[PDB]
Amino acid sequence: PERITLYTAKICPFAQRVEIALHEAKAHHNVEQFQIDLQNKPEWYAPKVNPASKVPAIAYGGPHVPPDQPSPESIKLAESLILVEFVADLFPHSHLLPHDPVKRAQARFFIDGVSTKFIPAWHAFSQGKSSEEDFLTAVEHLQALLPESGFAVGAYSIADVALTPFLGRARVTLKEDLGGYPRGEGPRVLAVLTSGTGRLARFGKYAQDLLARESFQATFDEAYITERYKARFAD
Amino acid sequence: PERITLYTAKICPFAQRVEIALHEAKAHHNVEQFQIDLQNKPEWYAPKVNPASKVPAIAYGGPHVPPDQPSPESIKLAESLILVEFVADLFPHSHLLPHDPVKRAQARFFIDGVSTKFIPAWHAFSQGKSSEEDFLTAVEHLQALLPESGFAVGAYSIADVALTPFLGRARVTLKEDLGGYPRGEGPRVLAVLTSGTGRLARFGKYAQDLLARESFQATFDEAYITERYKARFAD
Numbered sequence A, B: 001p002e003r004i005t006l007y008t009a010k011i012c013p014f015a016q017r018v019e020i021a022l023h024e025a026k027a028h029h030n031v032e033q034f035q036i037d038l039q040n041k042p043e044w045y046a047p048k049v050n051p052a053s054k055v056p057a058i059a060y061g062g063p064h065v066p067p068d069q070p071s072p073e074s075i076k077l078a079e080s081l082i083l084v085e086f087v088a089d090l091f092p093h094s095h096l097l098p099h100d101p102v103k104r105a106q107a108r109f110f111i112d113g114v115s116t117k118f119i120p121a122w123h124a125f126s127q128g129k130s131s132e133e134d135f136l137t138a139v140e141h142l143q144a145l146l147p148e149s150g151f152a153v154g155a156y157s158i159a160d161v162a163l164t165p166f167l168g169r170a171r172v173t174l175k176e177d178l179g180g181y182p183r184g185e186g187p188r189v190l191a192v193l194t195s196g197t198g199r200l201a202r203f204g205k206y207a208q209d210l211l212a213r214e215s216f217q218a219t220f221d222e223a224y225i226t227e228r229y230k231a232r233f234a235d
């Protein structure tokens, strides 16, 4: 494929979707990463790369230029889920997109549950807005989609890419008691989520498998995330 | 491909996405349609076809059975945008999904704008909740994505499928003064939207082209929609 510049940020789960995808494609060393400081965004980023002023975004093709001077001739692409499909298209040997039309629809249906159920319910519960039961119920929705063994549709796919960054960050939030509930409640919910026993036994197994995946670990700066999450809570 | 039973409803724009896709694939006569009465949904629909109890949904493969007795052995699939990709996958000669990875990402990005900007802003404005300017601005977002001529990415694609049912219904709502504003305001906004001149000149051309497309017209019961929309407003 043509050259890829990825504009990303270690803190951002949506960006990590694209980093995971590239890693599963064993292409993470082919691409040029540029880290965006979301508290001090470069003045060229929005007008030249992504008018929404968010990561992730990719510049595709065009001439070799420094990443802080992106070329007008490169194709600019945004939105994490699209970028993950684009990577799976560009690198078919990644096997991120299943061949079977049915399994693709199922993988994407799982992504829709991640978008419309898991992420909103995690946001609402981690921010003190909703109940623990509301979060567990949304997880149970994903659990009910899981097959007896393996990942969201058996073989690892884009469905697992879409979810893992948010699961990895939830774990930090919960493990570290940063969820706005008294000391120890976060960790108890983390156990429900990932123990592999109880109402969420099967999801727990799946979650263990997602967090163990090499592409997740390789694109996740746990020390950095933990530090930033503690500091934010402290405010 | 295997046999397709589509559970749909004439009133529903999300369902019409799948009807359009099938028609573009010239497969609309291969599939078995079953109309769901959304005010009196069959008691077998949610437990046997789609637990979300919404159209559209597809039953794929399995034995030949009556559509009100769907087989456990058919694969059940839901969510309009996924079903449109599934149809494009099943019937590649439809040309709904472009081959170029970049044009696919662009088509899907346009769909994201339909999902996150156009549809919410149309809902909010048609229901009396927001301003006309908020709706026009969201349309301008889509307009800015359009190429100089043609459809959302040139050749007709899934991007146009995703938008057209909602555009067709907006037109009825506006043409018929059913938008909650005084007589004549709906029609003036319709003119802004579809005249082909003014702040939305280019989108207007595009919109004319979407509503002229055979697949849209063939899957749109304008008389029925107009009747249902008038009656609802009258309440």
Ligand SMILES: *SC[C@H](NC(=O)CC[C@H](N)C(=O)O)C(=O)NCC(=O)O
Pocket: A011, A012, A013, A014, A015, A038, A053, A054, A055, A056, A078, A079, A080, A081
């Ligand atoms: S995580 C940091 C923020 N990114 C997004 O929210 C990505 C959302 C898109 N819908 C997607 O790609 O999936 C971000 O960059 N925020 C900008 C800021 O100034 O914080």
Ligand SMILES: *SC[C@H](NC(=O)CC[C@H](N)C(=O)O)C(=O)NCC(=O)O
Pocket: B011, B012, B013, B014, B015, B038, B053, B054, B055, B056, B078, B079, B080, B081
């Ligand atoms: S238009 C009728 C309703 N369908 C949907 O809302 C589909 C939404 C999905 N997200 C999609 O397929 O895109 C519907 O069936 N409502 C059920 C009812 O009882 O009204």
